[PDB]
Amino acid sequence: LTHQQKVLRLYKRALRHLESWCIHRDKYRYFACLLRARFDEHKNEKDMVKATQLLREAEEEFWHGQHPQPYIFPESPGGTSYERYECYKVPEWCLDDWHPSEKAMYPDYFAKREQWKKLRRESWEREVKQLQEETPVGGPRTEALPPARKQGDLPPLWWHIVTRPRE
Amino acid sequence: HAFFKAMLFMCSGSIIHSLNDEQDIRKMGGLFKAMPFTTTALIVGSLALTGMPFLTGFYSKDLIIEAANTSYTNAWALLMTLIATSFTAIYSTRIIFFALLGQPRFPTLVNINENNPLLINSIKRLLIGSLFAGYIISNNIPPTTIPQMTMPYYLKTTALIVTIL
Amino acid sequence: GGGAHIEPRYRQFPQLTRSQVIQAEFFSATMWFWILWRFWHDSDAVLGHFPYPDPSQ
Amino acid sequence: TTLDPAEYDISSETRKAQAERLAIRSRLKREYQLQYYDPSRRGVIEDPALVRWTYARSANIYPNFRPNTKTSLLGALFGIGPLVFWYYVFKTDRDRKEKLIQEGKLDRTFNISY
Amino acid sequence: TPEEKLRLQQLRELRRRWLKDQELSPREPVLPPQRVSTYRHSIFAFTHVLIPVWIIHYYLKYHVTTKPYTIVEKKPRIFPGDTILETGEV
Amino acid sequence: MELPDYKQWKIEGTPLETVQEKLAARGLRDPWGRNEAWRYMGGFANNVSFVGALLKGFKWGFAAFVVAIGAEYY
Amino acid sequence: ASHITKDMLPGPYPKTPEERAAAAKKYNMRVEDYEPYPDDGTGYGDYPKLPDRSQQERDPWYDWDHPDLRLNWGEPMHWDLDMYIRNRVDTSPTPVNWNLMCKHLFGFVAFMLFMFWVGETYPAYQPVGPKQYPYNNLYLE
Amino acid sequence: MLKYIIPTIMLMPLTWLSKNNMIWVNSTAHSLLISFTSLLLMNQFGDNSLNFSLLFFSDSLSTPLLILTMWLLPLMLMASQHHLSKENLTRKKLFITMLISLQLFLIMTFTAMELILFYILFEATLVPTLIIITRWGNQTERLNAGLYFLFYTLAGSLPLLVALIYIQNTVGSLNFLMLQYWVQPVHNSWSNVFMWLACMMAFMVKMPLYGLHLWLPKAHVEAPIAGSMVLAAVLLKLGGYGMLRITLILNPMTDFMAYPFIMLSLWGMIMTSSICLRQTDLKSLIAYSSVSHMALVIVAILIQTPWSYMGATALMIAHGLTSSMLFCLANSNYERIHSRTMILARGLQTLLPLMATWWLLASLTNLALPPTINLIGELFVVMSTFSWSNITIILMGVNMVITALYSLYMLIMTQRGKYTYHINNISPSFTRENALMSLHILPLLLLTLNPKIILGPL
Amino acid sequence: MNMFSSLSLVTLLLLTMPIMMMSFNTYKPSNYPLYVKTAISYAFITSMIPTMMFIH
Amino acid sequence: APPLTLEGIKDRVLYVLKLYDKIDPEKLSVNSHFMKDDSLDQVEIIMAMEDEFGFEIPDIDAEKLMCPQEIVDYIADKKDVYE
């Protein structure tokens, strides 16, 4: 993380912590531009300690008095009912063993199920042809070419390209 | 007491399912956003929760704190139990003043729904029995003990005034 | 999906079905019919009281 | 209590060449996902971090061990310590009860059970 | 960022295409298969409640004559003296 | 579907929007107000009342005590 | 059948730079604040080179943690520091150490002395002397 | 046993005599037919006592104990067929015969009529169980655990021959427990202390203590193929009942030195329960549970005076069905995940919903749901040692509280998400996996209907 | 007088009937939240009867 | 119980262009790229959807949100939109 974008990680949560405490909507909305004037103290300057002392005093009065049980937007890392839908929980590929008269239903769905597998069954003449080439030695985050230079299939095929939908 | 919150969590449960994901006292609005009936159901319950002026549990709540007149307590106990009668009463309006009073505010696609006679059968069956709870059972009972029957000046009903403030 | 009994909104105050409000209105009255037996007939202390019970002589 | 936990410190420009410690793990992550994505695996990953975990915890602690310190002989203050103390409770017990059971009586007369 | 531009364009042509694939129900694809197959209130409750009445009452009439402690019903709690006795009370 | 059209609300009453007039001694000033003034105005100032509204407007609080009392009464 | 550096060994100073990472990559090039020096204090039966403890700890807490699964659920490859105490434990909140609850429980510690007093309703206190006169002194007549 | 050992020895010239793969269906078929003959001639009345025929059987009169001994052989053959079918047929049939031979000595044992036939049968085991650990086990460090499986039980049991023949030449003859009417008392000496010491200490080798029990999480940790003889090792540990035979008489009055066996089995009781909440092995997880409430019964016996023999009769079979059933849970979920480490099993409860009921009721026998056969005896251990003193409820009650966590510590490990892995472990709990998982609670709660037969003299 | 507590034992018996019908022994076309609600619906008046005999 | 399709977000992302009074309703509809219109123009432009949508807006959502239709693109991946 860099020093300039360290301002941005605080700036969104500076106002996000405030609407936890408000009672109206305009009461929170009146303090948006009102807090903006403090942000408009040093508009554009150098990147040295003058920009760090604006953040070094943003240690206090940001963590100091921070969010007394705030809003959480319940579908989140925290919050209630964040992972509540777990009786279903999307068991993708639980459907290998059937021993049919249980595979009687959905006839066209299984006919398409084996169809997509040939896209995964034939990708390593193309994906592994660039997997040895795109990585220089052992370097950074290893996504492929996002078109794979002819046809990107996927590169992340198929557990990510057919990833779990929510309900 | 068994009448009360099985109504109340279920009456508030229709409100949360109406929005389907916040379950916060934040972002609620006023009472009348096409919500006639369940707001009428809450104020039956919330006024009873203030400390029973003549509502559902009046023949049980009042005959005990006025049975604390003749006692042999710590005397810190009567200086601790009767104060919470106000603290019970301020629980009531807290959902009135924050979910039922102010301007309408919560996120959009307002998909409210209150039309299911399955739920209407449940609420109507309770409140008929809820209001006549302490007033039919205690109306016909063989007596067991001796009542107080003396509640003097400056010592008698001021816990109701504790609820008023 | 299947039914359009109550419409979706964009904060325009979508109206009610105008039949729940009758039953909403009825049980706001029979609860205040019960303001009858609060005072009539019921008092705060139907007991009588003591004259600061002094006269021992 | 447990902890402060010191979620903020200083930078700019302490240890400019310290970065790309993710290059250790992203090479393993590339070795992870290439092992993870294949048309036929039918089995678990070897995952040697759990192999080196339990076997260097359940076993290979007694070859590590030596009694060259008294803080390794410190277990005398926890194992045999209270084990004398419960008997120091219980030896004082059961005899004071017995003397009141031998000399004098205190029980009810309908104590068939027991 | 201009790097992920070709990303998430073919992914929408793969993931949502898989969801276009996943949205699939050919003529309600239940077979089921084979085979097939209010006012009464005549036997739905009569099998429910009206049958176990006679069985358990037989289990009590055949119980008091066997066990020496049957029902152990308490005293009369009578303030006057009445016709079940011969005397009266003021 | 197409209910939130622009140039629709166009803040006109809304005494809550007097705080945007309050910042005129500082100057911010135009952008923006329509977010917090989305659903405050219109019939959204219905504004359910004080203790009378928990008596439900005195609409049914004291209706049937004078009609029930009373006859016979000899 | 993995025999090469199958576990830890009698460390921690048998050329500790050649420990991490010829195998067991807890450190990248023996300067990552996770080189296998942290044998707590040895002599005991603790961990040796031990790709183990005093590395940065006190929580895997199931964070946002999107660059892999990587928090606690979804198997990052080789970052084992300590386990079996953390599937139910967390990081620091906004308040700090202050044990005010014993002072909060001290509210009855003043009224614990009030437990010695009596609680008769009538009459009032008049706490000046023995003129209160609790029990029976004289006879009928 | 008139003819109980007699039909089952004829089952032995039937394994290698038979055909090919028919040997599994044939061996199970004959085996259940003996189970009725066990039930029939036994369970007779009944008032002190049923001396059965002669000098080889006293009919297990005071404690039946013998029905449980005969379930297991038509119960493990269906379990051992998980991972055994990779060898020659003549080598696999030898593995069948040695387990059948294990039952025959234990059929004559638990009745045994005597004491000089007891010890030769008390040591008649440990020969077939040791061979099972050596061949067709798991990965290495087997052979030291085979040596720790010896050199303790044999180390402690040898002074019994020093003790018993010293009794046989002194006072009468120990052929008959019922000719033990004349029993001289034993006073406090410096010779008689050792006489009681060798009489008792060998029985602490099998049902363990806080001491000398390191071998017990070796045979259960390093174990045969899929809990095969591990189920038999459950009866091997509980089958040290013979303290009930011996110390009921034959120095009963030495209780002055009972205390360090009371205390050591009591603080060690509360300790070894919590010694496994940070364990990383499934087969070690049930093993330390099997120490704790098996160490509960020892203070029920050295403390005399029944209302203690009542529950201790039932507490032997309490985990004897339960821990055998838990090992059946642990023998499963290993043919599908080939490592026994519990942490790798995140993301269960969704692939196998049918056996998820069986996880619930099994661990509901440790909380134990007081109308069962488990909390019907633990209340009588309460009923005894509270009459000893008022302190004993404390350390014994926390044992009922630690295993409340320690059982549900396993159940919650099944519930996790997205499972990260497992293109294997597909198999949705086939017929052998769930029919063998049955027939444990199916007699257990059945015995809770009229629990009259599970009662000692007593 | 025998039917003072006999109706209580009937009340303490019909709860098992949705459990006895869980064994798929000619079970009802499923409607199981409805069938349970009906099973509770007739026990209440059965529960109402011996309350009147107690207060006499 | 109410479903959702592609057309709801195509209203709202275009609507907040006119809701914010700094941006006139004369820009481009779906691809304005926001540089022709540092803080408070990459956070404030999505602080309104913090009020309306508000699913906490993670750290990677800033550097993608330059292309205003690339804002709309991944929401259908998150909100699981039709077909």
Swiss-Prot record, chain B:
Core subunit of the mitochondrial membrane respiratory chain NADH dehydrogenase (Complex I) which catalyzes electron transfer from NADH through the respiratory chain, using ubiquinone as an electron acceptor. Essential for the catalytic activity and assembly of complex I. This is NADH-ubiquinone oxidoreductase chain 5. It is found in: Mitochondrion inner membrane. It comes from the Eukaryota. It comes from Bos taurus. The chain crosses the membrane at residues 35-55, 82-102, 126-146, 151-165. Belongs to the complex I subunit 5 family. The chain holds residues 332 to 496 of 606 of the full protein. Core subunit of respiratory chain NADH dehydrogenase (Complex I) which is composed of 45 different subunits.
Curated annotation (Swiss-Prot), chain C:
Keywords: Electron transport, Membrane, Mitochondrion, Mitochondrion inner membrane, Respiratory chain, Transit peptide, Transport. One of its GO terms (biological process) is mitochondrial respiratory chain complex I assembly. It is a peripheral membrane protein. One of its GO terms (cellular component) is mitochondrial inner membrane. It is found in: Mitochondrion inner membrane. Coiled coil: none annotated. Accessory subunit of the mitochondrial membrane respiratory chain NADH dehydrogenase (Complex I), that is believed not to be involved in catalysis. Complex I functions in the transfer of electrons from NADH to the respiratory chain. The immediate electron acceptor for the enzyme is believed to be ubiquinone. Complex I is composed of 45 different subunits. Belongs to the complex I NDUFB2 subunit family. This is NADH dehydrogenase [ubiquinone] 1 beta subcomplex subunit 2, mitochondrial. It comes from Bos taurus (Bovine). The lineage of its organism: Eukaryota, Metazoa, Chordata, Craniata, Vertebrata. The chain holds residues 38 to 94 of 108 of the full protein.
From Swiss-Prot, chain F:
It is found in: Mitochondrion inner membrane. The modification N6-acetyllysine is found at residue 10. GO terms for biological process: electron transport chain; mitochondrial respiratory chain complex I assembly. The modification N6-succinyllysine is found at residue 10. Keywords: Acetylation, Electron transport, Membrane, Methylation, Mitochondrion, Mitochondrion inner membrane, Respiratory chain, Transmembrane, Transmembrane helix, Transport. The chain holds residues 14 to 87 of 98 of the full protein. Accessory subunit of the mitochondrial membrane respiratory chain NADH dehydrogenase (Complex I), that is believed not to be involved in catalysis. Complex I functions in the transfer of electrons from NADH to the respiratory chain. The immediate electron acceptor for the enzyme is believed to be ubiquinone. It is a single-pass membrane protein. Its main location: mitochondrion. Complex I is composed of 45 different subunits. The chain crosses the membrane at residues 48-70. One of its GO terms (cellular component) is respiratory chain complex I. Methylation at His residues by METTL9 enhances complex I-mediated mitochondrial respiration. It comes from the Eukaryota. Belongs to the complex I NDUFB3 subunit family. This is NADH dehydrogenase [ubiquinone] 1 beta subcomplex subunit 3.
Swiss-Prot record, chain G:
One of its GO terms (biological process) is mitochondrial electron transport, NADH to ubiquinone. Its main location: mitochondrion. GO terms for cellular component: mitochondrial inner membrane; respiratory chain complex I. It is a single-pass membrane protein. It is found in: Mitochondrion inner membrane. Keywords: Electron transport, Membrane, Mitochondrion, Mitochondrion inner membrane, Respiratory chain, Transit peptide, Transmembrane, Transmembrane helix, Transport. Belongs to the complex I NDUFB8 subunit family. Accessory subunit of the mitochondrial membrane respiratory chain NADH dehydrogenase (Complex I), that is believed not to be involved in catalysis. Complex I functions in the transfer of electrons from NADH to the respiratory chain. The immediate electron acceptor for the enzyme is believed to be ubiquinone. Complex I is composed of 45 different subunits. This is NADH dehydrogenase [ubiquinone] 1 beta subcomplex subunit 8, mitochondrial. The gene is NDUFB8. The chain holds residues 29 to 169 of 186 of the full protein.
